Amino acid sequence: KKIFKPEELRQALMPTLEALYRQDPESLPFRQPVDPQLLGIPDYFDIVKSPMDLSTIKRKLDTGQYQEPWQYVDDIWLMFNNAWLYNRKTSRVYKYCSKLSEVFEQEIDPVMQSLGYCCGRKLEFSPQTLCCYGLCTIPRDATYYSYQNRYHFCEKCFNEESVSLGQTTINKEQFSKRKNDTLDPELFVECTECGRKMHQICVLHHEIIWPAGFVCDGCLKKSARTRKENKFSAKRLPSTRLGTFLENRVNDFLRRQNHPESGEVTVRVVHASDKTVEVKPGMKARFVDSGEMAESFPYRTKALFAFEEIDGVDLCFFGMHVQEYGSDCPPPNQRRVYISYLDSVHFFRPKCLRTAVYHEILIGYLEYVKKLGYTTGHIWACPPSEGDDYIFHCHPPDQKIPKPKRLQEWFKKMLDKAVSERIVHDYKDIFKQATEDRLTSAKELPYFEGDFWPNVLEESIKESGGSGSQKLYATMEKHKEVFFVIRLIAGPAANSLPPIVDPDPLIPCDLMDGRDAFLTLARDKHLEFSSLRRAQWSTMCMLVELHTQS
Numbered sequence: 242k243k244i245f246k247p248e249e250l251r252q253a254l255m256p257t258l259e260a261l262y263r264q265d266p267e268s269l270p271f272r273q274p275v276d277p278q279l280l281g282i283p284d285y286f287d288i289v290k291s292p293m294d295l296s297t298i299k300r301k302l303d304t305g306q307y308q309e310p311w312q313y314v315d316d317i318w319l320m321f322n323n324a325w326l327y328n329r330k331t332s333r334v335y336k337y338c339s340k341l342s343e344v345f346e347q348e349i350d351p352v353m354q355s356l357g358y359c360c361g362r363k364l365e366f367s368p369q370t371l372c373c374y375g376l377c378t379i380p381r382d383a384t385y386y387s388y389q390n391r392y393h394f395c396e397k398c399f400n401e402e403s404v405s406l407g408q409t410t411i412n413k414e415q416f417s418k419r420k421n422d423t424l425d426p427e428l429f430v431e432c433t434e435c436g437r438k439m440h441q442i443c444v445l446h447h448e449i450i451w452p453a454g455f456v457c458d459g460c461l462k463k464s465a466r467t468r469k470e471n472k473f474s475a476k477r478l479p480s481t482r483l484g485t486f487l488e489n490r491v492n493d494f495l496r497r498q499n500h501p502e503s504g505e506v507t508v509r510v511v512h513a514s515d516k517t518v519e520v521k522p523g524m525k526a527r528f529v530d531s532g533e534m535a536e537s538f539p540y541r542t543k544a545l546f547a548f549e550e551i552d553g554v555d556l557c558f559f560g561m562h563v564q565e566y567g568s569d570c571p572p573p574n575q576r577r578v579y580i581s582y583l584d585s586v587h588f589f590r591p592k593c594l595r596t597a598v599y600h601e602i603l604i605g606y607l608e609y610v611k612k613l614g615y616t617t618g619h620i621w622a623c624p625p626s627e628g629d630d631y632i633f634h635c636h637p638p639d640q641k642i643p644k645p646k647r648l649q650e651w652f653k654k655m656l657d658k659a660v661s662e663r664i665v666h667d668y669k670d671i672f673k674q675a676t677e678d679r680l681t682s683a684k685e686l687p688y689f690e691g692d693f694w695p696n697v698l699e700e701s702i703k704e705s706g707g708s709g710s711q712k713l714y715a716t717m718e719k720h721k722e723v724f725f726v727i728r729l730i731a732g733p734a735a736n737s738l739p740p741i742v743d744p745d746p747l748i749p750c751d752l753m754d755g756r757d758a759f760l761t762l763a764r765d766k767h768l769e770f771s772s773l774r775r776a777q778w779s780t781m782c783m784l785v786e787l788h789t790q791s
């Protein structure tokens with residue numbers, strides 16, 4: 242419907258082109274088509290297959306060759322990328338190009354908005370971090386070697402003449418040499434009325450939620466219409482006793498604070514299933530085969546998430562998975578909870594209450610399981626490894642990751658509040674707790690899925706040639722600050738408790754059975770949590786998936 246008259250485009254866009262022209266000397270290298278012979282650059286057309294320059298763009302603009310402004314934008318960016326491709330990162334033309342692109346970004350955005358568009362930005366997704374086979378990492382722009390887009394090797398790892406994969410043998414000549422410089426553009430959706438192309442993420446159009454098609458805000462307002470209601474919301478996910486309890490605690494806290502521009506928080510439990518952790522081969526040979534320790538321990542895993550409405554749209558800002566070992570579970574795991582992992586995306590409003598809200602969620606959770614008859618909570622204060630994510634794929638680059646001391650103090654501050662509220666009786670590091678329990682053997686340590694202690698015990702038994710317990714106190718002392726043991730129910734009352742009965746039903750949801758599936762989904766579908774807009778999109782997609790798979 243909306244056809245842009247060539248004078249309309251010229252009038253609107255020419256000032257953005259002049260802005261580049263008037264950059265001296267930066268503009269000069271880009272004003273005329275590259276003559277490779279005259280400049281003395283022979284291989285230019287071996288690399289650059291679609292040459293572009295300011296004159297060519299000016300001409301297309303003067304002669305009405307563009308039907309819509311993104312075509313102008315694409316040519317501008319082609320010119321820039323041609324120069325960034327051909328010239329060295331350290332060169333003159335490269336840095337000049339970079340300067341022009343900055344001028345362009347600033348110029349183009351408000352112009353495109355004047356023409357009825359979401360924005361004028363050039364948007365591309367973050368490059369994924371590439372592993373090796375033999376646990377190292379390949380960074381962005383570093384040359385590397387790959388086979389079947391599956392087996393990749395860092396350049397140093399490669400030069401040492403046939404590779405083993407899995408176990409078949411592949412000559413080095415069969416590998417691709419390439420740079421990790423590939424970035425996927427953001428996708429557009431077309432307004433079904435005016436025909437304008439908008440960033441799908443800018444407008445948050447999801448085809449399942451609005452199957453009749455995308456209609457831009459401009460077109461809606463002209464006829465005083467509004468979008469059909471999004472029924473795939475966080476609020477409409479099924480309620481649980483636990484979720485309700487946590488969200489009530491949070492919102493009651495927020496109401497007491499009465500900070501300006503506070504929003505309601507929604508907490509939902511999205512997975513609950515029964516699982517078992519098996520004792521690993523070292524500990525099994527040592528204690529299971531002689532009948533001193535159970536071969537495996539049953540637990541219930543749960544996943545829960547907190548959401549806030551920001552700018553009218555759902556935003557998932559906190560996630561946590563827990564392991565719950567009930568009253569039927571054998572010692573040493575009986576009546577214990579362990580936090581598998583928690584994660585957050587730092588967009589909560591108001592900022593000044595963010596930490597407080599996370600603490601309320603954790604304190605609430607401890608309070609809840611205490612009420613059910615769980616006696617003891619367990620936390621391993623372990624920051625994610627460099628450039629890894631616990632739950633949310635691709636964090637904002639300006640969200641800092643706490644180092645261990647800061648994270649330890651954060652847990653201590655939470656627990657101190659829990660103690661002052663008479664929820665937590667007390668808490669101790671693992672070394673002090675073992676001392677208090679008069680622990681003598683490794684078989685007496687709680688044994689959790691994915692935890693530090695099962696792995697270090699394997700290593701210890703093998704290193705010592707058969708002892709599980711020799712250096713155990715020394716190992717606990719050495720790592721003590723990182724391991725919290727939290728007494729919810731103390732003393733004689735902990736010995737005569739009734740069975741634990743959880744009133745909430747099981748909740749099958751394969752997507753949220755541990756962290757891996759949602760990380761995989763997010764990676765495969767470009768669901769990043771790296772900016773407010775991308776997190777809002779990713780939340781919207783996550784919620785559709787949660788609503789439709791169940």
Ligand SMILES: C/C=C/C(=O)SCCNC(=O)CCNC(=O)[C@@H](O)C(C)(C)COP(=O)(O)OP(=O)(O)OC[C@H]1O[C@@H](n2cnc3c(N)ncnc32)[C@H](O)[C@@H]1OP(=O)(O)O
Binds near residue numbers: 583586587624641
């Ligand atoms: C076995 C499994 C165990 C676990 O999962 S334990 C939990 C581990 N999880 C994670 O760490 C997941 C990712 N982290 C989170 O989501 C974590 O934030 C989190 C989920 C705590 C939440 O942390 P908070 O936002 O409540 O607090 P932080 O310590 O992250 O940040 C507070 C503060 O410290 C600053 N900070 C944080 N790190 C640093 C550094 N490094 N240097 C300097 N300053 C720093 C940060 O910028 C902030 O500054 P201001 O708001 O501007 O005052």
Ligand SMILES: [Zn+2]
Binds near residue numbers: 359360361362443
């Ligand atoms: Zn946009």
Ligand SMILES: [Zn+2]
Binds near residue numbers: 373374377378395
């Ligand atoms: Zn390597």
Ligand SMILES: [Zn+2]
Binds near residue numbers: 433434
């Ligand atoms: Zn429209």
Ligand SMILES: [Zn+2]
Binds near residue numbers: 500591593
């Ligand atoms: Zn404030």
